[model samples]
Target: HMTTQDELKRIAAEKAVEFVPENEYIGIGTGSTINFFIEALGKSGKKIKGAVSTSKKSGELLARYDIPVVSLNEVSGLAVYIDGADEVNHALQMIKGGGGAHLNEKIVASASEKFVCIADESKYVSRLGKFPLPVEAVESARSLVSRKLLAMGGQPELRIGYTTFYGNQIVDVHGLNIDQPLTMEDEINKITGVLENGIFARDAADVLILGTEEGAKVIYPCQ
Candidate 1:
């Protein structure tokens, strides 16, 4: 018998909570893995002073867990930021935004001292583009951004019926060779009308807690 993927996610989530410093401000991110994280943290009874949430769903989960939610403006700084990635390479650079919250996720991760990514083993990849990269842009600038993405040799498709929490559209770009992740991340963001792309290279994970068949294993950026 094999363990369910959700079980793997929960294993990583439980391990991630251990990295949460006691009675301090933190940043919590969105996604299924993070859902389990909030649950584990809630049931663990660890007291965090406050948390800046990247999405409304995460905020609601925090409330349900009785964890205090604070605005990023109110908090001087965060001790840590926890989130999940769509795919991550050995270097710890990731493709996030599968949940369409990467803009806020990047902002919160940038403001934090550490970025902790939790995910199942399947998410670990040798290369990133296997998962389509997501780009967030304003509704009015959709065509401008999509065309720009096409020019960059990617097949940009608008995610139908889904808008980001910040009221923007998500354009998922497929088949781009991300040989240079940091460069690609910056280049995508530089496109006018583009808010941010899913590439997490600029703000890559400080630590990755990957849930495996054996257990949760901690990983750091290679070299």
Candidate 2:
């Protein structure tokens, strides 16, 4: 008997809904895993004041569950930000933006008091660079940013025909050593024309609820 990735995702999602505090603003991140979380949250009958959504899709789903979606500006802070990662290390630093929604995800996550990442076992890794890093950039500076990325020892490939929710473009960088995640996160954002990158080192997940074949594993950052 084998539990599919989708099943694992659901397990984690259901477990994460328990962490949602009642009657407070929260942030919902974008991705399939998060989709499960929203559904679970809605069914749990937990009443939150409002939710800040990272993407239109998440917002619509939240609406289906009758969860009120609020603007980030309207709230002073979020009690928690629940999201998914493409790859999350033991330190809880992970790469996101596979859905091209990371720019808003980062902003919303930053405003939250706690960040909870939900993913299947496959997303948990010892290293961080295996997945291509997604970097949101201004269209006008695409070439310029690519050149700068090359200089930083990464191969940046433009994600053609895909535009971010913020009306920006994404450049997926590959083959770079992310030995120092926090420093690399800062260095990449320092480049001109870069809106934001996929690295979540600085605002790493405070808690990770990972779905494994055995069950949902609640993990915290390595001390």
Candidate 3:
């Protein structure tokens, strides 16, 4: 028998928290699973230097725990970014941006040396794109980006009433069948109006940790 999804999420979150490295600055990701990780990390009594949050919401949560939110400019290097994914394949390619912070998440992930993705077993997918992929775009270029995405066979919609930390907008793309994540990732990014797309294939997870009835399990992705 398997634990409930909530239990699975808590299991994964605790595991990821326990795995947090002792660095001056830690990279933080956004979403519900990450919220659990934040709570565990706060109560773990482990010494932390600072945290670089990828979203305003997570940063606020960190501040509530007295965890100083460090700016990326303040840190020269970092070891890991712990985040949750909307969907992940065996290759560790993920579909993120469920929380609308995909751009900042990507920025933090790219800056960090490694990314650790936390998820419940239910989120594992044989392929990517069941969950809509979010693409961050300038407000002025929404139509252009949407047209391009539509031409590529995706349903791009404006994520109503949401804006990015960089003052950009989000275009959530649906109806995608991304079997070739690395290629699609780079290709989507080439769109004229796209600041960053939700595809993380070129920037796949270095480590994947999932929660099951047996407890947290580590997944290895090829380098």
Q: TM-score per candidate, in order?
A: 0.98, 0.99, 0.94
**The candidate that achieves the highest TM-score relative to the unseen native structure:** 2
Off by over 4 Å in 3: none
Model 3, 1-223: lDDT tens digits are 6588888998999988767876557899999899888988988877788899998889988988777788999988677889999998888889888888888888899888888999999888888888898999999999999999999999999999988889999999999988689889898999988999888887789889999988899998844
Shift in Å, residue 65, candidate 3: 1.6
- Sort the candidates on TM-score, descending order: 2, 1, 3
lDDT by residue for model 1 (150-192), tens:
9999999999999888888999999999989999999998998
lDDT of 2: 0.96
After superposition, candidate 1 runs with Cα above 4 Å error: none
Number of backbone-clashing residue pairs for each candidate, in the order shown = 0, 0, 0
RMSD to native, candidate 2: 0.6
lDDT of all predictions? 0.94, 0.96, 0.88
Question: How close to the true structure is residue 56 of candidate 2, measured as C-alpha lDDT?
Answer: 92
Clashes of 2: 0
| Model 1 lDDT at residue 178 | 92
Candidate numbers, best lDDT first, in rank order: 2, 1, 3
